[PDB]
Write a protein that holds these residues in place. Structure first.
Motif, PDB file in Angstrom:
ATOM      1  N   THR A   7      41.946  33.743   0.423  1.00 40.24           N
ATOM      2  CA  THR A   7      41.732  33.550  -1.099  1.00 40.24           C
ATOM      3  C   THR A   7      41.048  34.642  -1.649  1.00 40.24           C
ATOM      4  OG1 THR A   7      42.209  31.302  -0.678  1.00 40.24           O
ATOM      5  CG2 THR A   7      41.735  32.058  -3.095  1.00 40.24           C
ATOM      6  N   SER A   8      41.696  35.910  -1.523  1.00 38.17           N
ATOM      7  CA  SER A   8      40.970  37.018  -2.056  1.00 38.17           C
ATOM      8  C   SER A   8      40.836  37.137  -3.590  1.00 38.17           C
ATOM      9  CB  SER A   8      41.786  38.343  -1.589  1.00 38.17           C
ATOM     10  OG  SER A   8      42.869  38.574  -2.361  1.00 38.17           O
ATOM     11  N   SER A   9      41.550  36.465  -4.120  1.00 35.38           N
ATOM     12  CA  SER A   9      41.315  36.069  -5.487  1.00 35.38           C
ATOM     13  C   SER A   9      40.093  35.608  -6.174  1.00 35.38           C
ATOM     14  CB  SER A   9      42.557  35.154  -5.945  1.00 35.38           C
ATOM     15  OG  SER A   9      43.585  35.573  -5.529  1.00 35.38           O
ATOM     16  N   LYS A  14      34.056  41.807  -6.113  1.00 30.12           N
ATOM     17  CA  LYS A  14      33.196  42.096  -5.226  1.00 30.12           C
ATOM     18  C   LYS A  14      33.953  43.521  -4.404  1.00 30.12           C
ATOM     19  CE  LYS A  14      30.529  38.205  -4.020  1.00 30.12           C
ATOM     20  NZ  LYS A  14      30.013  37.218  -3.251  1.00 30.12           N
ATOM     21  N   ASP A  15      35.092  43.165  -4.297  1.00 30.24           N
ATOM     22  CA  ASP A  15      36.246  44.346  -3.943  1.00 30.24           C
ATOM     23  C   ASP A  15      36.182  45.566  -4.867  1.00 30.24           C
ATOM     24  OD1 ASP A  15      37.953  44.935  -1.614  1.00 30.24           O
ATOM     25  OD2 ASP A  15      39.153  45.369  -3.430  1.00 30.24           O
ATOM     26  N   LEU A  16      36.067  45.195  -6.005  1.00 26.89           N
ATOM     27  CA  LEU A  16      36.187  46.182  -6.961  1.00 26.89           C
ATOM     28  C   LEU A  16      35.014  46.982  -7.350  1.00 26.89           C
ATOM     29  CD1 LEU A  16      38.840  43.977  -9.225  1.00 26.89           C
ATOM     30  CD2 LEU A  16      39.228  46.513  -8.244  1.00 26.89           C
ATOM     31  N   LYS A  20      35.043  51.106  -7.123  1.00 24.40           N
ATOM     32  CA  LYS A  20      34.418  51.830  -8.084  1.00 24.40           C
ATOM     33  C   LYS A  20      33.259  52.773  -7.338  1.00 24.40           C
ATOM     34  CE  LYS A  20      35.593  49.056 -12.156  1.00 24.40           C
ATOM     35  NZ  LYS A  20      36.184  50.296 -13.055  1.00 24.40           N
ATOM     36  N   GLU A  21      32.775  52.177  -6.319  1.00 21.50           N
ATOM     37  CA  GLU A  21      31.710  53.241  -5.528  1.00 21.50           C
ATOM     38  C   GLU A  21      32.334  54.075  -4.640  1.00 21.50           C
ATOM     39  OE1 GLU A  21      29.015  51.024  -2.410  1.00 21.50           O
ATOM     40  OE2 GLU A  21      27.692  51.007  -4.405  1.00 21.50           O
TER      41      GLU A  21
END
Length: 28
Positions: A7-9, A14-16, A20-21
């Motif tokens: 459930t990556s949703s 935290k992934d985004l 951005k980094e």
């Protein structure tokens, strides 16, 4: 299909901050 990604949703914000980094470090 997200059940095969544990459930990556829920974690995707935290992934985004990763996406951005990692991406500012590609412009740096």
């Amino acid at each position: 299909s997200d059940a095969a990604v544990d459930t990556s949703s829920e974690i995707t914000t935290k992934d985004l901050k990763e996406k951005k980094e990692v991406v500012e470090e590609a412009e740096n």
